Amino acid sequence: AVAPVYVGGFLARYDQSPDEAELLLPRDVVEHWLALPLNINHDDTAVVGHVAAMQSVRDGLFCLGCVTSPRFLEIVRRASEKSELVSRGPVSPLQPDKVVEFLSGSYAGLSLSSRFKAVALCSVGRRRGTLAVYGRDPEWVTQRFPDLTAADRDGLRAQWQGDPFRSDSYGLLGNSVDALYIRERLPKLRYDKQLVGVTERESYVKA
Amino acid sequence: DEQQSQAVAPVYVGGFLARYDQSPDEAELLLPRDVVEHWLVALPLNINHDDTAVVGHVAAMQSVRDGLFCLGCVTSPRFLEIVRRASEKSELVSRGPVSPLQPDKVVEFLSGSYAGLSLSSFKAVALCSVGRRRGTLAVYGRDPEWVTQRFPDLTAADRDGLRAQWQRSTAVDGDPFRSDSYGLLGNSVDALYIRERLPKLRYDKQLVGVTERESYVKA
Numbered sequence: 001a002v003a004p005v006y007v008g009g010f011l012a013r014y015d016q017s018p019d020e021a022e023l024l025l026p027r028d029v030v031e032h033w034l035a036l037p038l039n040i041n042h043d044d045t046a047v048v049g050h051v052a053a054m055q056s057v058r059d060g061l062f063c064l065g066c067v068t069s070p071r072f073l074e075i076v077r078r079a080s081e082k083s084e085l086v087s088r089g090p091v092s093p094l095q096p097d098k099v100v101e102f103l104s105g106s107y108a109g110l111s112l113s114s115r116f117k118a119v120a121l122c123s124v125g126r127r128r129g130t131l132a133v134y135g136r137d138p139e140w141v142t143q144r145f146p147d148l149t150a151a152d153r154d155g156l157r158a159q160w161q162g163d164p165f166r167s168d169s170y171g172l173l174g175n176s177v178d179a180l181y182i183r184e185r186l187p188k189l190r191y192d193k194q195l196v197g198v199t200e201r202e203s204y205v206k207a
Numbered sequence: 208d209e210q211q212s213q214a215v216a217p218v219y220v221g222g223f224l225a226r227y228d229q230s231p232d233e234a235e236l237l238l239p240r241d242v243v244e245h246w247l248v249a250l251p252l253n254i255n256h257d258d259t260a261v262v263g264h265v266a267a268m269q270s271v272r273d274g275l276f277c278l279g280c281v282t283s284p285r286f287l288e289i290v291r292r293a294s295e296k297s298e299l300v301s302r303g304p305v306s307p308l309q310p311d312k313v314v315e316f317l318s319g320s321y322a323g324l325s326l327s328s329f330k331a332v333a334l335c336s337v338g339r340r341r342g343t344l345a346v347y348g349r350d351p352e353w354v355t356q357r358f359p360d361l362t363a364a365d366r367d368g369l370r371a372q373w374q375r376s377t378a379v380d381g382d383p384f385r386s387d388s389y390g391l392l393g394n395s396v397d398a399l400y401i402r403e404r405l406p407k408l409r410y411d412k413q414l415v416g417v418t419e420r421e422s423y424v425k426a
Contacts, residue, residue: 075389082386082393085400105396113224123399167296169388174296175320176395180336180404181299181425206400 001077001099005067005134008141011112013060013129023127030061033116038065041175042113048072051089051119053159056186059147063152064138064156065119069165074104091201100134104204108132123179124188131192134204146197154192214291218281219356223415224326226274226342231398236340245271248331249377252279255394256333261285261383264334267372270366277333277353278369283384289391290316291357296406314347321345321426322408336398337407347423359416406408
């Protein structure tokens with residue numbers, strides 16, 4: 001469980017038009033700019049790992065991150081054991097993985113904060129199509145996305161191939177109540193799941 | 208530290224455990240007035256039906272015109288301290304309650320997290336994210352009278368009945384809470400996937416008229 005956990009997904013979809021103008025992120029700007037810390041919902045006292053790769057592809061900006069913080073993984077491990085959702089396990093093929101499943105359930109989205117400053121794991125991203133996919137092997141995670149080509153993965157593989165977490169369970173729990181009041185949280189996540197062709201039938205995605 | 212102390216003071220919670228005017232689709236959730244009044248020592252108060260998460264006790268239970276109403280008291284020092292620490296790391300709580308009300312981090316976190324009531328078969332009363340029976344909105348407050356007053360359906364007669372009960376030292380209490388922050392965190396992801404959580408909660412609030420009053424309810 002405490003072993004590293006990889007997370008991948010789109011930080012932005014070019015064909016997607018943001019609601020707020022501030023979330024506009026065109027291809028040329030992204031390509032022009034192309035390690036970023038990985039934190040929990042933009043709280044820089046909650047860094048859990050780092051972005052291990054970023055690739056601008058046909059449909060958007062894809063990234064792969066690695067959750068390495070032992071403190072964070074341990075807190076997650078303990079919490080996962082007290083989750084009814086986690087206890088239900090994944091769908092038929094995949095084998096149970098409490099930590100990966102808790103992470104899939106709690107932080108189902110990605111959020112690129114451009115103050116690029118950091119990638120935050122959050123309950124749902126503010127940009128659509130930013131579903132977060134967790135797994136123990138980065139190849140497997142990248143393979144969860146149909147839009148990526150072999151050439152796309154080669155570029156990503158080339159990249160990914162003191163505990164920074166200064167928060168606690170209390171902080172994560174305080175974050176959880178905020179998550180319950182995010183409007184259209186599940187519909188957004190399902191929309192994202194649809195847009196990137198990821199199913200619960202071949203991943204740990206809970207939405 | 209002084210305010211920190213107030214935060215961990217007792218929290219009362221009130222609301223209907225069942226609405227006689229609501230017909231549930233599932234038979235296991237049926238709870239008729241005659242059955243309630245017949246069955247009608249303090250019941251334990253727990254978090255989402257977890258025996259290892261008892262946070263207090265029920266201080267009053269009353270069958271009134273519109274359903275079964277109950278009042279409970281959250282007393283566990285450990286649970287309250289956990290909640291206090293988490294409440295300070297919540298954007299929702301930072302925004303505060305509707306104007307006139309005094310901010311109360313602990314009361315607000317409880318109002319946001321465990322907005323529903325769920326009566327288990329009487330064995331216990333559980334604070335949950337949303338109850339399976341409709342109209343089971345949970346209302347938190349520092350004083351029993353105030354909480355009871357948030358419900359327009361209760362008459363002066365109804366309150367006098369409840370009051371007599373809570374003014375009356377339970378067997379539930381040292382600290383009965385045998386869980387921790389990790390336990391509550393684990394449970395919080397479960398709540399994120401309950402279907403139509405917010406709509407149900409808004410329907411509940413309007414059904415019991417808590418909308419017509421001002422409270423710490425976040426839904």
